[PDB]
Design a binder for this molecule. Sequence first.
Ligand code: YGR
Ligand code: YGR
Ligand code: YGR
Ligand code: YGR
Ligand code: YGR
Ligand code: YGR
Ligand code: YGR
Lengths: 40, 234, 81, 81, 81, 81, 81, 81, 81, 81, 81, 41
Amino acid sequence: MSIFIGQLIGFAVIAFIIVKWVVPPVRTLMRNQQEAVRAA
Amino acid sequence: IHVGHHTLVFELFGMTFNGDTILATAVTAVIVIALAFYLRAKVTSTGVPSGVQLFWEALTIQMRQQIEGSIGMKIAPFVLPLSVTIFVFILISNWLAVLPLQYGGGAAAELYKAPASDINFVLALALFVFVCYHAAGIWRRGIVGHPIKVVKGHVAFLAPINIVEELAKPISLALRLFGNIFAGGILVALIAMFPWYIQWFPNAVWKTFDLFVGLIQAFIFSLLTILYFSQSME
Amino acid sequence: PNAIITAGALIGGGLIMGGGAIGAGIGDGIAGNALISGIARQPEAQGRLFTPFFITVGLVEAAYFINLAFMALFVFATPGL
Amino acid sequence: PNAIITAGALIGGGLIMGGGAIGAGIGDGIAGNALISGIARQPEAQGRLFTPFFITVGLVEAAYFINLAFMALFVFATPGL
Amino acid sequence: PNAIITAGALIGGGLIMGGGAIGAGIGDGIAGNALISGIARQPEAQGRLFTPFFITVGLVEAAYFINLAFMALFVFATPGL
Amino acid sequence: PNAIITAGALIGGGLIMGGGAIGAGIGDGIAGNALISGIARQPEAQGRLFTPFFITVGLVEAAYFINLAFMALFVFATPGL
Amino acid sequence: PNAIITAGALIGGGLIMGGGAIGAGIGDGIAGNALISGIARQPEAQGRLFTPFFITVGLVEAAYFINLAFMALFVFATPGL
Amino acid sequence: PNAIITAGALIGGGLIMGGGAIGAGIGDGIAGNALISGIARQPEAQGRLFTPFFITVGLVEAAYFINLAFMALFVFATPGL
Amino acid sequence: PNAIITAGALIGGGLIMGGGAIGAGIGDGIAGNALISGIARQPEAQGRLFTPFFITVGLVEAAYFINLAFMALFVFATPGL
Amino acid sequence: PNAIITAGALIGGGLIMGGGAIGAGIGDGIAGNALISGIARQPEAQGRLFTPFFITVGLVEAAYFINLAFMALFVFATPGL
Amino acid sequence: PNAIITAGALIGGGLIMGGGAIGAGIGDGIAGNALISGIARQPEAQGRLFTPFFITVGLVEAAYFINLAFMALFVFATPGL
Amino acid sequence: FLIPNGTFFAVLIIFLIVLGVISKWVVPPISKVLAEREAML
Ligand SMILES: COc1cc([C@](O)(CCN(C)C)[C@@H](c2cc3cc(Br)ccc3nc2OC)c2cc(OC)nc(OC)c2OC)cc(OC)n1
Ligand SMILES: COc1cc([C@](O)(CCN(C)C)[C@@H](c2cc3cc(Br)ccc3nc2OC)c2cc(OC)nc(OC)c2OC)cc(OC)n1
Ligand SMILES: COc1cc([C@](O)(CCN(C)C)[C@@H](c2cc3cc(Br)ccc3nc2OC)c2cc(OC)nc(OC)c2OC)cc(OC)n1
Ligand SMILES: COc1cc([C@](O)(CCN(C)C)[C@@H](c2cc3cc(Br)ccc3nc2OC)c2cc(OC)nc(OC)c2OC)cc(OC)n1
Ligand SMILES: COc1cc([C@](O)(CCN(C)C)[C@@H](c2cc3cc(Br)ccc3nc2OC)c2cc(OC)nc(OC)c2OC)cc(OC)n1
Ligand SMILES: COc1cc([C@](O)(CCN(C)C)[C@@H](c2cc3cc(Br)ccc3nc2OC)c2cc(OC)nc(OC)c2OC)cc(OC)n1
Ligand SMILES: COc1cc([C@](O)(CCN(C)C)[C@@H](c2cc3cc(Br)ccc3nc2OC)c2cc(OC)nc(OC)c2OC)cc(OC)n1
């Protein structure tokens, strides 16, 4: 029970970190690739 | 910390199977199959690629570039699928452990344990790669020619060293993947010994960095597979 | 009798991880020093330097993680007991 | 019996942390030496040099963390206790 | 019983300080070597060369501090005592 | 008496694996530092540099696993047991 | 008795001094290598280079003194005695 | 009586191979760094550079071999049994 | 009771001088590498290279000397004996 | 009595050879690194470079040899036994 | 009682020799690397280079010798016996 | 825990399936897409 709550708080922290600092760059990359593809 | 004790263990064909590891491998396989099928349905040469199309394109381009720079794609067309499937399999296996699929017994149990944490999974991948590039070397050199080149290597008078390095290629390639993920399975367990109000911090940081660690391990395993193929084919 | 074997296994595993950590840290530092020097001299080389880098790292990490695995064998499944 | 195992675990954890400190410190020093040399050579590359740096620091500091965990296993949760 | 645990804890703390001192000294020496070489090559870089330095030192001084902490736990609060 | 034998064998195997880890990791890091630097300077030299590199690593790895082969002989065979 | 504790404290303090000596010697030798190279490549910069030098030697020689402050604690005070 | 003798022999042989592994791995890595750097800087020099290399690795790998041999004497023919 | 403390003090002094000799040798070698390379590159500055050299050596030889002194204190004036 | 002294002598000789092998291997690696770099840069220097190299190796292997001798003295003519 | 002190003295002397051998080998290798590089790039400079080199080797071989002395004091003239 | 088990095969089989699927569902279509990409420019 307690282990699940602690790990879930940790996973919320991980999700927040990736969404705030990891998701933005690898979203750009994807958007830049799509823009380049539609360019040609 | 109760290392080992694979759950769902059963027996069939007169041999024992770790049920939990098989379940994790099947979950990873179905995720990879879903990605492949969603690509196949939505693969566009002329349209704007989807997210899965971009992911697969980037991975395939990276592996194809590695093959081009190590051993010509004409010589090794069969190694690109191997590298791509290896990379995705290990990456998904490692990253599925980031999901909060663990709970408390009163020891900590984990619904999804990364399959690489089991010796069988990493040993199977390493031995499959071993047999694959040794067969490739046999095909490109001959049944008798290939062992001679393998033993000789690049320096003849270092014949035993080669014979060790060769046997070191699978072992390391397995254990390097084993200990990296196996170790993680212990840390998450160790961090589980903390109370919930301070457990999240070490767990959070460890798994945030374990995302990158698993990505790097999948990349390294695939890269070394390609390198061993380039070595053993010429 | 089991206490002495357990203590010896703990000391051996501590030695294994100490050596593995020393090797991993120093070798990874040296490889990353090469990587950073290369990216400083040729900032456009970064993309091509991750292949020979993660190869090197891949080698170095092995010496660590193999050791790590064996420590578990020393610690949780002591060969003698 | 418990005293011997606890003393062996303390010595093993001391080895773990000594090796981890040596590896982490020396690897961080080498990677930061590369970073300092690069930023001396190419100040405009400062930011571009922080990507290969934190990766290298990420590789060593990961190992250290693992070490710091395993010592915590040896010292507080002596496996062979 | 407590005598064996205390002796083992003292040996472990000695190992922790030995490793921490080796790592801290050598890593600080390497980072300072980079800093001194950079300042020698060009004076105006000094102002920037202290940002990567104090970062690297911060990584190398953290490890030592961590070890500095754990010996304080080993000897003054010997776990398992 | 076999308890002392097993404890000594475990400590000796831990020393073997720690030394092997240190040597293998640091030597692989040095060789890969050379490889990464050479590829950074001359990318076209990549394929040329892997021939000597994998000779040198081939030796370094052979120092590791041979030691590992002996550690097994210490812990699983334990000569003199 | 505490004779075992005293022997363990002596071994621990010996480890502390050994690691501190290794770290201090090697790190300040590296810093001095940088200083000598900088003065050789630019003999007019001697005084300049003494600012960063004594900083890193300040970090390298601090680690020694701290270790010197703890070996004395180990053998003269022996906190666990 | 023999138990302690052969336990000490096991620890000593482990030390012998730990030192041999460290020396062999690091020396081979350094010689390989030299060889790779020479081949990268002088592509046509490879055939030449293997004579200085195997001499170096000859002296390095020789030491390891001796250590290995002596471990056998320590381990399978332990003196003073 | 005094025999155990004496053996521990002998081991501790051995560790003290082992670390001191390692640090002294390696640091003196590094400083001498700097000096020799600078004299080769800038022979006219031979004198100006000796002030930063004897300083560095002066630090290294200090670290050794202190250790030696304490080794005496360990072996001849064993604290807690 | 005899068994304890023999085990201690075996451990001491193992330490002697481990340190000797570390020093010999790493010193040979460094000297051969210089030799390989010089021969790669200066072909005709191959003849002239083997005189300093043989001196350096002479100073390195000698240490190893000395250690070897003393290790024999420890294990075949154990003093104080 | 004399057996315990003799075993401890043997271990301590082995530690002294291991540290002295490591330091001597590595420092001699580093100094000889400097000498070899200087004589490779400055063929006619070797004469001058032999002045600092023998100074460096003087400080290195000195430390070894001192260690070689005290190990004898540990082994033949055990202070604590 | 380092001793292999039957799961070995149970893993290998599964991996082979993926190796098969990616061998035809993924790699050839992606190579075709990249070839068309090169052709159109
Ligand atoms: C006093 O400060 C610290 C710092 C640490 C570190 O371990 C670094 C120590 N090192 C530099 C010697 C550190 C860390 C952990 C990493 C783990 C992985 Br996997 C990969 C990279 C890492 N990089 C890291 O720093 C770059 C760390 C650990 C942690 O544990 C709960 N929480 C953190 O908060 C986010 C944390 O960052 C501050 C630990 C610690 O405890 C004793 N005290
Ligand atoms: C299975 O492979 C090996 C290889 C070795 C070596 O020791 C090298 C180990 N290293 C790379 C870490 C190896 C060796 C010995 C040398 C001796 C001198 Br003097 C000088 C140079 C040497 N270089 C060497 O390889 C570069 C060796 C040993 C040996 O033992 C009877 N027979 C040999 O010839 C048949 C032999 O050569 C191939 C040992 C070993 O033991 C398990 N297994
Ligand atoms: C002589 O004085 C000291 C100094 C220390 C240090 O550890 C550095 C020692 N080193 C140079 C070998 C030091 C320190 C800690 C750091 C921690 C992290 Br994370 C990252 C960088 C650090 N950098 C640091 O100095 C650059 C430190 C530790 C501490 O502990 C409660 N309190 C401090 O007051 C804020 C403190 O700063 C003065 C310890 C000590 O104890 C005996 N005595
Ligand atoms: C190849 O097998 C060997 C080699 C040795 C050496 O030690 C070198 C080992 N090393 C490379 C790790 C070697 C030696 C000794 C030196 C002594 C001084 Br002082 C200065 C330079 C030296 N250089 C040396 O070689 C460069 C040596 C020692 C010796 O003693 C009985 N007899 C010799 O003649 C036959 C002899 O030359 C071959 C020892 C040995 O014994 C187990 N087996
Ligand atoms: C056989 O000769 C020696 C030499 C030493 C030294 O330690 C050098 C050790 N090295 C070579 C590793 C040496 C020394 C000490 C220094 C101390 C400081 Br702080 C700063 C610089 C130093 N530089 C030093 O050499 C340049 C030394 C020590 C000492 O002790 C009372 N008396 C000395 O005066 C005669 C003395 O020579 C100035 C020790 C020794 O003991 C057996 N035997
Ligand atoms: C030979 O004489 C010495 C010198 C020391 C030093 O530690 C340096 C030793 N090293 C060179 C190996 C030294 C020192 C301390 C420093 C502390 C910090 Br934080 C930061 C930089 C330091 N730099 C230092 O020298 C560069 C020191 C320590 C101290 O404590 C009692 N009192 C001192 O003044 C009387 C003192 O001289 C300033 C110790 C010692 O032990 C018996 N004997
Ligand atoms: C060659 O056989 C040797 C050599 C030594 C040396 O230590 C070198 C050790 N090395 C090779 C690891 C050596 C020595 C001592 C020095 C002392 C100082 Br302070 C400063 C510089 C020194 N340089 C030295 O050589 C460069 C030495 C010591 C000594 O004492 C009995 N007698 C010697 O004359 C016979 C002697 O040769 C001049 C020791 C030894 O012991 C078995 N056997």
